[PDB]
Write an enzyme that holds these catalytic residues in place. Structure first.
Site, PDB file in Angstrom:
ATOM      1  N   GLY A  69       0.723  -1.377   0.668  1.00 40.42           N
ATOM      2  CA  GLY A  69       0.020   0.548  -0.265  1.00 40.42           C
ATOM      3  C   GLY A  69       1.038   1.138   0.314  1.00 40.42           C
ATOM      4  O   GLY A  69       2.022   1.075  -0.643  1.00 40.42           O
ATOM      5  N   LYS A  77       3.912   2.679   7.891  1.00 34.79           N
ATOM      6  CA  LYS A  77       4.093   1.975   6.222  1.00 34.79           C
ATOM      7  C   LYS A  77       3.974   1.068   6.866  1.00 34.79           C
ATOM      8  O   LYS A  77       4.766   0.628   7.558  1.00 34.79           O
ATOM      9  CB  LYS A  77       5.537   2.864   5.879  1.00 34.79           C
ATOM     10  CG  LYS A  77       5.565   4.592   5.459  1.00 34.79           C
ATOM     11  CD  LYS A  77       7.061   3.907   4.826  1.00 34.79           C
ATOM     12  CE  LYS A  77       7.213   5.821   4.436  1.00 34.79           C
ATOM     13  NZ  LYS A  77       6.216   6.263   3.270  1.00 34.79           N
ATOM     14  N   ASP A 120     -15.535  -1.005  14.824  1.00 33.97           N
ATOM     15  CA  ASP A 120     -15.883  -0.456  13.362  1.00 33.97           C
ATOM     16  C   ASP A 120     -15.370  -2.007  12.635  1.00 33.97           C
ATOM     17  O   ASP A 120     -13.663  -0.943  11.445  1.00 33.97           O
ATOM     18  CB  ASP A 120     -14.713   1.144  13.575  1.00 33.97           C
ATOM     19  CG  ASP A 120     -14.651   1.814  12.257  1.00 33.97           C
ATOM     20  OD1 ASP A 120     -15.776   1.876  12.151  1.00 33.97           O
ATOM     21  OD2 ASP A 120     -13.703   1.868  11.637  1.00 33.97           O
TER      22      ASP A 120
HETATM   23  C1  LIG Z   1       2.101 -10.279  -0.619  1.00 29.86           C
HETATM   24  C2  LIG Z   1       1.338  -9.142  -0.660  1.00 29.86           C
HETATM   25  O1  LIG Z   1       1.417  -9.078   0.699  1.00 29.86           O
HETATM   26  C3  LIG Z   1      -0.168  -8.153   0.425  1.00 29.86           C
HETATM   27  C4  LIG Z   1      -0.777  -7.483  -0.353  1.00 29.86           C
HETATM   28  C5  LIG Z   1      -1.632  -7.066  -0.564  1.00 29.86           C
HETATM   29  C6  LIG Z   1      -2.143  -5.740  -1.423  1.00 29.86           C
HETATM   30  O2  LIG Z   1      -2.874  -6.956  -2.709  1.00 29.86           O
HETATM   31  N1  LIG Z   1      -2.770  -4.619  -1.542  1.00 29.86           N
HETATM   32  C7  LIG Z   1      -2.791  -4.189  -0.187  1.00 29.86           C
HETATM   33  C8  LIG Z   1      -3.589  -3.983  -2.955  1.00 29.86           C
HETATM   34  C9  LIG Z   1      -2.409  -6.432   1.644  1.00 29.86           C
HETATM   35  C10 LIG Z   1      -1.867  -7.304   2.070  1.00 29.86           C
HETATM   36  C11 LIG Z   1      -0.711  -7.909   1.747  1.00 29.86           C
HETATM   37  N2  LIG Z   1      -0.209  -8.573   2.744  1.00 29.86           N
HETATM   38  C12 LIG Z   1       0.028  -7.878   4.383  1.00 29.86           C
HETATM   39  N3  LIG Z   1      -0.120  -6.720   4.308  1.00 29.86           N
HETATM   40  C13 LIG Z   1      -0.435  -6.110   5.400  1.00 29.86           C
HETATM   41  O3  LIG Z   1      -1.048  -4.772   5.379  1.00 29.86           O
HETATM   42  C14 LIG Z   1      -1.267  -4.209   4.521  1.00 29.86           C
HETATM   43  C15 LIG Z   1      -0.794  -2.606   4.873  1.00 29.86           C
HETATM   44  C16 LIG Z   1      -1.487  -1.903   3.455  1.00 29.86           C
HETATM   45  C17 LIG Z   1      -2.944  -2.194   3.978  1.00 29.86           C
HETATM   46  C18 LIG Z   1      -4.027  -1.137   2.834  1.00 29.86           C
HETATM   47  O4  LIG Z   1      -3.757  -1.331   4.971  1.00 29.86           O
HETATM   48  C19 LIG Z   1      -3.576  -3.378   3.800  1.00 29.86           C
HETATM   49  C20 LIG Z   1      -2.789  -4.109   5.164  1.00 29.86           C
HETATM   50  C21 LIG Z   1      -0.035  -6.572   6.687  1.00 29.86           C
HETATM   51  C22 LIG Z   1       0.150  -6.992   8.353  1.00 29.86           C
HETATM   52 CL1  LIG Z   1       0.159  -4.730   8.850  1.00 29.86          CL
HETATM   53  C23 LIG Z   1       0.732  -7.488   8.545  1.00 29.86           C
HETATM   54  N4  LIG Z   1       0.643  -7.974   7.352  1.00 29.86           N
HETATM   55  C24 LIG Z   1       1.003  -8.095   6.886  1.00 29.86           C
HETATM   56  N5  LIG Z   1       0.376  -8.285   5.306  1.00 29.86           N
HETATM   57  C25 LIG Z   1       2.451  -8.301  -1.107  1.00 29.86           C
HETATM   58  F1  LIG Z   1       2.476  -7.254  -1.343  1.00 29.86           F
HETATM   59  F2  LIG Z   1       3.832  -8.300   0.058  1.00 29.86           F
HETATM   60  F3  LIG Z   1       3.060  -8.819  -1.770  1.00 29.86           F
END
Ligand SMILES: C[C@@H](Oc1cc(C(=O)N(C)C)ccc1Nc1nc(O[C@H]2CC[C@@](C)(O)CC2)c2c(Cl)c[nH]c2n1)C(F)(F)F
EC number: 2.7.12.1
Length: 254
Positions: free
Chosen positions: A18, A24, A133
């Protein structure tokens, strides 16, 4: 290969997950070639109410490690006056992102995810927390298992419960039920119960209006219909509880 050291272990930053500013999240690789998500919080510009909310959330997260594997694991952390680094398991994707893509969901997948959601949310209610929420972005898919990432402690109206509207003293565990209900309801009908309602002032009024009947179209799984109907009663006293949902046919009988 930007690097980060936490309690004496070096991670290589692969990429950022994100955006966000003050916090971050990063995907990283350790010395053992294992992936982790590392949350970075900048504390430089943060008051004491904010600090204390961050500190309380990290405590509940660290405490509830042992009580359910449907809370995201927190392997290590560092906290200083300037920053926080938190080493967490990496999810595949967040539930919100996933729902926006997927057209339909396997019914077994739906059910399995539901139980995950209840196991998590029940665990926090047992330690005196009510999220208040809950939305799909609060859940992370990790190897086809839903896990809860945020407790609502640290500093879309479509998943918002009647009690929380009537307030803006009245938020109980039943409030989280309404919200999980909303999420299940999207998972079964492709929309939250009030997506079609346009203005935000109109949505809020529909959530609390006893005369606004929620459409439940009939579906093969008649038990699922009954869970949606029970989660989504406007009176919290009438509304089903989580221990009751864990004893419901939907969850218990194939
Ligand atoms: C494996 C994949 O992980 C995630 C991808 C995605 C994705 O496709 N998005 C956000 C569009 C989402 C989550 C992934 N893994 C993911 N994301 C996290 O936080 C995102 C931060 C941004 C948001 C918007 O608050 C959503 C949670 C955390 C945390 Cl804290 C702890 N472990 C996590 N694993 C990566 F991006 F790392 F390749």
């Amino acid at each position: 290969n930007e690097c980060i050291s936490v309690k004496g272990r070096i991670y290589s930053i692969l990429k950022q997950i994100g955006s966000g500013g003050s916090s971050k999240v990063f995907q990283v690789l350790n010395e053992k070639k294992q992936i982790y998500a590392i949350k970075y919080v900048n504390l430089e510009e943060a008051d004491n109410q904010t600090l204390d909310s961050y500190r309380n959330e990290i405590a509940y997260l660290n405490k509830l490690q042992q009580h359910s594997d449907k809370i995201i694991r927190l392997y290590d952390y560092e906290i200083t006056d300037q920053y926080i680094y938190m080493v967490m398991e990496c999810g595949n994707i967040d539930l919100n992102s996933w729902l926006k893509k997927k057209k339909s969901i396997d019914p077994w997948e739906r059910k399995s995810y539901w139980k995950n959601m209840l196991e998590a949310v029940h665990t926090i209610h047992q330690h005196g927390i009510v999220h208040s929420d809950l939305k799909p972005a609060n859940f992370l898919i990790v190897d086809g298992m839903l896990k809860l990432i945020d407790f609502g402690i640290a500093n879309t109206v479509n998943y918002m419960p009647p009690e929380a509207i009537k307030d803006m003293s009245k938020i109980s565990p039943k409030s989280d039920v309404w919200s999980l209900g909303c999420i299940l309801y999207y998972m079964t009908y492709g929309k939250t119960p009030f997506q079609q309602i346009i203005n935000q002032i109109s949505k809020l009024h529909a959530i609390i209006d006893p005369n606004h009947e929620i459409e439940f179209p009939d579906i093969p799984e008649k038990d699922l219909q009954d869970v949606l109907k029970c989660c989504l009663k406007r009176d919290p006293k009438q509304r089903i509880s989580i221990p009751e949902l864990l004893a419901h046919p939907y969850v218990q009988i194939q």
